[PDB]
Amino acid sequence: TDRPDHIDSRVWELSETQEDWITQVHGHVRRVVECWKYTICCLISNPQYDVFKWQDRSTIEWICSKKKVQYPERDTPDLYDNRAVAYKVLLVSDLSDHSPTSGIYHDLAFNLEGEAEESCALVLRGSQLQDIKGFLCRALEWVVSNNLTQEVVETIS
Amino acid sequence: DRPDHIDSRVWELSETQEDWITQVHGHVRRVVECWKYTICCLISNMHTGAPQYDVFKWQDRSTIEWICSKKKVQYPERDTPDLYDNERAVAYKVLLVSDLSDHSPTSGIYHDLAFNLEGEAEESCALVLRGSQLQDIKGFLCRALEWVVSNNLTQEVVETI
Protein backbone atom coordinates (compact mmCIF):
# COMPACT_ATOMS: atom_id res chain seq x y z
CA THR A 1 0.00 0.00 0.00
CA ASP A 2 3.10 2.21 -0.28
CA ARG A 3 4.53 3.85 -3.41
CA PRO A 4 5.80 1.96 -6.53
CA ASP A 5 9.32 2.28 -7.96
CA HIS A 6 8.41 3.97 -11.27
CA ILE A 7 6.71 6.85 -9.45
CA ASP A 8 9.07 9.63 -8.37
CA SER A 9 9.42 10.36 -4.67
CA ARG A 10 8.57 13.97 -5.46
CA VAL A 11 5.32 13.04 -7.18
CA TRP A 12 4.09 10.55 -4.57
CA GLU A 13 4.69 12.92 -1.68
CA LEU A 14 2.94 15.66 -3.66
CA SER A 15 -0.04 13.38 -4.36
CA GLU A 16 -0.85 12.51 -0.73
CA THR A 17 -2.78 15.64 0.26
CA GLN A 18 -4.41 16.20 -3.13
CA GLU A 19 -7.18 13.64 -2.56
CA ASP A 20 -8.62 11.49 0.23
CA TRP A 21 -7.52 8.12 -1.14
CA ILE A 22 -8.60 5.66 1.58
CA THR A 23 -12.10 7.07 1.09
CA GLN A 24 -12.11 5.77 -2.49
CA VAL A 25 -12.46 2.18 -3.68
CA HIS A 26 -9.14 1.00 -5.13
CA GLY A 27 -7.76 4.09 -3.44
CA HIS A 28 -4.15 3.09 -3.86
CA VAL A 29 -4.55 2.37 -7.58
CA ARG A 30 -6.46 5.61 -8.06
CA ARG A 31 -3.57 7.49 -6.46
CA VAL A 32 -1.03 5.73 -8.69
CA VAL A 33 -3.02 6.51 -11.84
CA GLU A 34 -3.18 10.20 -10.96
CA CYS A 35 0.57 10.06 -10.38
CA TRP A 36 0.89 8.74 -13.93
CA LYS A 37 -1.10 11.67 -15.28
CA TYR A 38 1.00 14.14 -13.29
CA THR A 39 4.24 12.54 -14.47
CA ILE A 40 3.08 12.85 -18.07
CA CYS A 41 2.37 16.51 -17.34
CA CYS A 42 5.96 16.95 -16.14
CA LEU A 43 7.36 15.03 -19.11
CA ILE A 44 5.36 17.15 -21.54
CA SER A 45 6.38 20.43 -19.86
CA ASN A 46 10.09 19.60 -19.45
CA PRO A 47 9.10 26.66 -20.53
CA GLN A 48 5.99 26.37 -22.73
CA TYR A 49 3.62 24.78 -20.25
CA ASP A 50 2.48 25.63 -16.75
CA VAL A 51 1.48 22.53 -14.81
CA PHE A 52 -1.71 23.51 -13.01
CA LYS A 53 -2.42 20.01 -11.78
CA TRP A 54 -1.81 19.77 -8.03
CA GLN A 55 -0.40 23.31 -7.82
CA ASP A 56 -0.14 25.16 -4.53
CA ARG A 57 -2.86 27.82 -4.37
CA SER A 58 -3.01 28.50 -0.62
CA THR A 59 -1.12 31.78 -1.04
CA ILE A 60 -3.49 32.76 -3.86
CA GLU A 61 -6.56 31.63 -1.89
CA TRP A 62 -5.16 33.74 0.94
CA ILE A 63 -4.89 36.91 -1.14
CA CYS A 64 -8.46 36.44 -2.37
CA SER A 65 -9.57 36.08 1.25
CA LYS A 66 -8.10 39.43 2.26
CA LYS A 67 -9.67 41.19 -0.74
CA LYS A 68 -12.90 39.14 -0.85
CA VAL A 69 -12.94 39.01 -4.67
CA GLN A 70 -13.21 35.41 -5.88
CA TYR A 71 -11.42 32.19 -4.94
CA PRO A 72 -9.59 30.46 -7.80
CA GLU A 73 -11.79 28.02 -9.71
CA ARG A 74 -11.50 24.34 -8.72
CA ASP A 75 -12.07 23.12 -12.28
CA THR A 76 -8.54 23.64 -13.59
CA PRO A 77 -6.79 22.13 -16.65
CA ASP A 78 -3.80 19.88 -15.93
CA LEU A 79 -1.50 22.19 -17.91
CA TYR A 80 -1.67 25.42 -19.90
CA ASP A 81 0.25 26.50 -23.00
CA ASN A 82 1.44 30.12 -23.00
CA ARG A 83 -0.68 29.86 -27.77
CA ALA A 84 -2.89 30.34 -24.70
CA VAL A 85 -4.25 26.77 -24.70
CA ALA A 86 -5.32 24.49 -21.86
CA TYR A 87 -4.90 20.70 -21.81
CA LYS A 88 -6.10 17.72 -19.77
CA VAL A 89 -4.23 14.41 -19.71
CA LEU A 90 -6.39 11.30 -20.21
CA LEU A 91 -5.69 7.60 -19.89
CA VAL A 92 -8.01 5.55 -22.09
CA SER A 93 -8.65 1.95 -23.20
CA ASP A 94 -9.43 2.68 -26.86
CA LEU A 95 -7.91 5.54 -28.84
CA SER A 96 -10.33 4.37 -31.52
CA ASP A 97 -13.47 4.73 -29.41
CA HIS A 98 -12.50 8.15 -28.11
CA SER A 99 -14.45 11.41 -28.15
CA PRO A 100 -13.34 14.81 -26.87
CA THR A 101 -14.28 15.56 -23.26
CA SER A 102 -13.91 19.32 -23.70
CA GLY A 103 -13.44 21.89 -26.44
CA ILE A 104 -11.61 24.10 -23.93
CA TYR A 105 -9.46 21.63 -22.00
CA HIS A 106 -8.14 19.71 -24.93
CA ASP A 107 -7.56 16.04 -24.32
CA LEU A 108 -4.15 14.44 -24.42
CA ALA A 109 -5.23 10.81 -24.43
CA PHE A 110 -2.89 7.83 -24.06
CA ASN A 111 -3.05 4.05 -23.91
CA LEU A 112 -1.62 2.15 -20.98
CA GLU A 113 0.87 1.08 -23.65
CA GLY A 114 1.68 4.76 -24.10
CA GLU A 115 0.16 5.25 -27.55
CA ALA A 116 -1.12 8.78 -28.06
CA GLU A 117 -4.39 9.78 -29.70
CA GLU A 118 -3.97 11.37 -33.15
CA SER A 119 -4.40 14.96 -31.95
CA CYS A 120 -2.28 14.29 -28.87
CA ALA A 121 0.58 12.93 -30.99
CA LEU A 122 0.63 16.14 -33.06
CA VAL A 123 1.15 18.32 -30.00
CA LEU A 124 4.03 16.28 -28.61
CA ARG A 125 7.54 15.94 -29.95
CA GLY A 126 8.93 12.47 -30.53
CA SER A 127 11.31 13.10 -27.64
CA GLN A 128 8.32 13.52 -25.33
CA LEU A 129 6.33 10.54 -26.62
CA GLN A 130 9.28 8.19 -26.13
CA ASP A 131 9.59 9.18 -22.47
CA ILE A 132 5.84 8.84 -21.88
CA LYS A 133 5.69 5.51 -23.73
CA GLY A 134 8.81 4.47 -21.84
CA PHE A 135 7.37 5.53 -18.49
CA LEU A 136 3.98 3.90 -19.04
CA CYS A 137 5.72 0.67 -20.03
CA ARG A 138 7.33 0.60 -16.58
CA ALA A 139 3.93 1.34 -15.09
CA LEU A 140 2.21 -1.55 -16.86
CA GLU A 141 4.97 -3.87 -15.62
CA TRP A 142 4.05 -2.93 -12.06
CA VAL A 143 0.37 -3.37 -12.91
CA VAL A 144 0.70 -7.01 -13.97
CA SER A 145 3.32 -7.79 -11.30
CA ASN A 146 0.66 -7.03 -8.69
CA ASN A 147 -2.07 -8.50 -10.91
CA LEU A 148 -3.86 -5.15 -10.73
CA THR A 149 -5.00 -5.18 -14.37
CA GLN A 150 -8.73 -5.19 -13.63
CA GLU A 151 -8.50 -2.47 -10.97
CA VAL A 152 -6.71 -0.09 -13.35
CA VAL A 153 -9.01 -0.73 -16.31
CA GLU A 154 -12.01 -0.10 -14.05
CA THR A 155 -10.43 3.09 -12.71
CA ILE A 156 -9.90 4.26 -16.30
CA SER A 157 -13.51 3.63 -17.33
CA ASP B 1 -33.94 8.72 -30.77
CA ARG B 2 -30.94 10.29 -32.52
CA PRO B 3 -30.45 10.65 -36.27
CA ASP B 4 -27.61 8.53 -37.70
CA HIS B 5 -25.39 11.31 -39.05
CA ILE B 6 -25.34 12.94 -35.59
CA ASP B 7 -22.70 11.44 -33.28
CA SER B 8 -23.82 9.73 -30.06
CA ARG B 9 -21.66 12.02 -27.91
CA VAL B 10 -23.12 15.11 -29.56
CA TRP B 11 -26.65 13.79 -29.05
CA GLU B 12 -26.05 12.93 -25.37
CA LEU B 13 -24.42 16.31 -24.83
CA SER B 14 -27.32 18.14 -26.47
CA GLU B 15 -30.09 16.78 -24.21
CA THR B 16 -29.83 19.17 -21.26
CA GLN B 17 -28.47 22.19 -23.16
CA GLU B 18 -31.97 23.45 -23.88
CA ASP B 19 -35.51 22.49 -22.88
CA TRP B 20 -36.53 21.06 -26.25
CA ILE B 21 -39.93 19.73 -25.18
CA THR B 22 -40.92 23.35 -24.51
CA GLN B 23 -40.34 24.50 -28.10
CA VAL B 24 -42.65 24.33 -31.14
CA HIS B 25 -40.23 22.27 -33.28
CA GLY B 26 -37.94 21.34 -30.42
CA HIS B 27 -36.66 18.08 -31.92
CA VAL B 28 -35.57 19.77 -35.13
CA ARG B 29 -33.87 22.59 -33.20
CA ARG B 30 -32.02 20.02 -31.11
CA VAL B 31 -30.65 18.45 -34.30
CA VAL B 32 -29.94 21.85 -35.87
CA GLU B 33 -27.86 22.87 -32.86
CA CYS B 34 -26.09 19.52 -33.17
CA TRP B 35 -25.11 20.51 -36.72
CA LYS B 36 -23.66 23.77 -35.42
CA TYR B 37 -21.85 21.89 -32.66
CA THR B 38 -20.53 19.34 -35.15
CA ILE B 39 -19.43 22.15 -37.46
CA CYS B 40 -17.59 23.62 -34.46
CA CYS B 41 -15.90 20.27 -33.89
CA LEU B 42 -15.09 19.91 -37.59
CA ILE B 43 -13.52 23.38 -37.62
CA SER B 44 -11.50 22.59 -34.49
CA ASN B 45 -9.82 19.54 -36.03
CA MET B 46 -7.29 22.14 -37.24
CA HIS B 47 -3.93 22.49 -35.47
CA THR B 48 -1.26 25.19 -35.59
CA GLY B 49 0.60 21.30 -33.50
CA ALA B 50 -1.51 23.05 -30.87
CA PRO B 51 -5.30 23.33 -31.38
CA GLN B 52 -6.25 26.43 -33.37
CA TYR B 53 -9.77 26.70 -31.93
CA ASP B 54 -11.43 26.42 -28.53
CA VAL B 55 -15.08 25.32 -28.82
CA PHE B 56 -17.08 27.19 -26.17
CA LYS B 57 -20.44 25.72 -27.25
CA TRP B 58 -22.16 23.42 -24.74
CA GLN B 59 -19.15 23.64 -22.40
CA ASP B 60 -19.31 23.77 -18.60
CA ARG B 61 -19.66 27.40 -17.54
CA SER B 62 -16.79 26.97 -15.08
CA THR B 63 -14.46 26.01 -17.94
CA ILE B 64 -15.58 28.95 -20.07
CA GLU B 65 -15.12 31.37 -17.17
CA TRP B 66 -11.60 30.07 -16.52
CA ILE B 67 -9.96 30.42 -19.96
CA CYS B 68 -11.73 33.70 -20.66
CA SER B 69 -9.91 35.03 -17.61
CA LYS B 70 -6.63 33.63 -18.99
CA LYS B 71 -7.35 34.99 -22.48
CA LYS B 72 -8.42 38.37 -21.09
CA VAL B 73 -11.67 38.11 -23.03
CA GLN B 74 -15.35 38.18 -21.95
CA TYR B 75 -18.84 37.43 -23.29
CA PRO B 76 -22.45 37.61 -21.97
CA GLU B 77 -23.89 34.20 -20.99
CA ARG B 78 -26.72 35.07 -23.38
CA ASP B 79 -24.54 35.63 -26.44
CA THR B 80 -21.33 33.63 -25.97
CA PRO B 81 -19.40 32.69 -29.08
CA ASP B 82 -19.45 29.11 -30.34
CA LEU B 83 -15.70 28.96 -30.87
CA TYR B 84 -12.56 31.05 -30.40
CA ASP B 85 -9.51 31.19 -32.66
CA ASN B 86 -6.47 31.02 -30.39
CA GLU B 87 -4.00 32.15 -33.03
CA ARG B 88 -5.86 35.18 -34.36
CA ALA B 89 -7.63 35.85 -31.04
CA VAL B 90 -11.06 36.15 -32.65
CA ALA B 91 -14.39 34.74 -31.46
CA TYR B 92 -16.97 33.13 -33.77
CA LYS B 93 -20.60 32.01 -33.89
CA VAL B 94 -21.78 29.30 -36.29
CA LEU B 95 -24.87 30.35 -38.23
CA LEU B 96 -27.09 28.38 -40.59
CA VAL B 97 -28.83 30.64 -43.09
CA SER B 98 -30.68 30.14 -46.37
CA ASP B 99 -29.14 33.15 -48.14
CA LEU B 100 -25.42 33.95 -47.96
CA SER B 101 -25.82 37.00 -50.19
CA ASP B 102 -27.12 39.69 -47.82
CA HIS B 103 -25.30 38.87 -44.57
CA SER B 104 -23.82 41.32 -42.08
CA PRO B 105 -22.80 40.87 -38.40
CA THR B 106 -25.46 39.30 -36.18
CA SER B 107 -23.54 40.60 -33.18
CA GLY B 108 -20.84 43.18 -32.47
CA ILE B 109 -19.37 40.84 -29.88
CA TYR B 110 -18.33 38.04 -32.26
CA HIS B 111 -17.78 37.42 -36.00
CA ASP B 112 -20.29 35.14 -37.80
CA LEU B 113 -19.44 31.90 -39.64
CA ALA B 114 -22.52 31.31 -41.81
CA PHE B 115 -23.30 28.18 -43.84
CA ASN B 116 -26.09 27.06 -46.16
CA LEU B 117 -28.21 23.94 -45.87
CA GLU B 118 -26.30 22.82 -48.96
CA GLY B 119 -23.07 23.28 -46.99
CA GLU B 120 -21.76 26.36 -48.80
CA ALA B 121 -19.83 28.90 -46.71
CA GLU B 122 -20.42 32.65 -46.66
CA GLU B 123 -17.73 34.86 -48.24
CA SER B 124 -16.25 36.19 -44.99
CA CYS B 125 -16.53 32.73 -43.46
CA ALA B 126 -14.73 31.11 -46.41
CA LEU B 127 -11.85 33.57 -46.05
CA VAL B 128 -11.28 32.47 -42.44
CA LEU B 129 -11.53 28.71 -42.93
CA ARG B 130 -9.28 26.40 -44.91
CA GLY B 131 -10.65 24.28 -47.76
CA SER B 132 -9.96 21.24 -45.58
CA GLN B 133 -12.51 22.49 -43.07
CA LEU B 134 -15.17 23.40 -45.64
CA GLN B 135 -15.16 19.98 -47.32
CA ASP B 136 -15.79 18.43 -43.90
CA ILE B 137 -18.67 20.81 -43.24
CA LYS B 138 -20.08 20.51 -46.77
CA GLY B 139 -19.77 16.73 -46.55
CA PHE B 140 -21.46 16.57 -43.16
CA LEU B 141 -24.29 18.93 -44.13
CA CYS B 142 -25.00 16.81 -47.21
CA ARG B 143 -25.46 13.88 -44.85
CA ALA B 144 -27.76 16.12 -42.81
CA LEU B 145 -29.68 17.46 -45.81
CA GLU B 146 -30.21 13.91 -47.06
CA TRP B 147 -31.61 12.91 -43.67
CA VAL B 148 -33.91 15.94 -43.75
CA VAL B 149 -35.45 14.89 -47.07
CA SER B 150 -35.43 11.19 -46.16
CA ASN B 151 -37.80 12.01 -43.28
CA ASN B 152 -39.54 14.86 -45.13
CA LEU B 153 -38.92 17.39 -42.34
CA THR B 154 -37.71 19.89 -44.94
CA GLN B 155 -40.12 22.80 -44.45
CA GLU B 156 -39.89 22.60 -40.66
CA VAL B 157 -36.13 23.19 -40.91
CA VAL B 158 -36.37 26.07 -43.40
CA GLU B 159 -38.75 28.12 -41.27
CA THR B 160 -36.79 27.81 -38.03
CA ILE B 161 -33.76 29.80 -39.21
Author numbering:
A (entry chain B): 2 to 47, 55 to 90, 92 to 166
B (entry chain A): 3 to 50, 53 to 165
Quoted from the paper:
The corresponding construct (residues 1 to 169) was cloned, expressed, purified and crystallized. The structure could not be solved by molecular replacement using that of IAV PA-Nter due to low sequence homology. THOV PA-Nter comprises four principle β-strands surrounded by six α-helices. Comparison of the two independent molecules in the asymmetric unit of crystal form 1 shows that the region 72–89, including helix α3 and the following loop, is in two very distinct orientations. In chain A, this element is positioned as in DHOV and IAV (see below) whereas in chain B it is dissociated from the body of the protein, rotated by 90° and inserted between two neighbouring molecules in the crystal. For THOV and DHOV PA-Nter the putative active site is more like an extended groove and furthermore, is positively charged. The extra positive charge in the putative active sites of THOV and DHOV PA-Nter arises from the replacement of acidic residues and the introduction of extra lysines (Lys38, Lys61 and Lys97 for THOV and Lys39 and Lys100 for DHOV PA-Nter). Surprisingly, for the THOV domain, addition of Mn2+ or Mg2+ ions destabilises the protein by 3–6°C. Interestingly, the significant difference in thermal stability behaviour of the THOV and DHOV domains correlates with the enhanced plasticity and much poorer diffracting crystals of THOV PA-Nter.
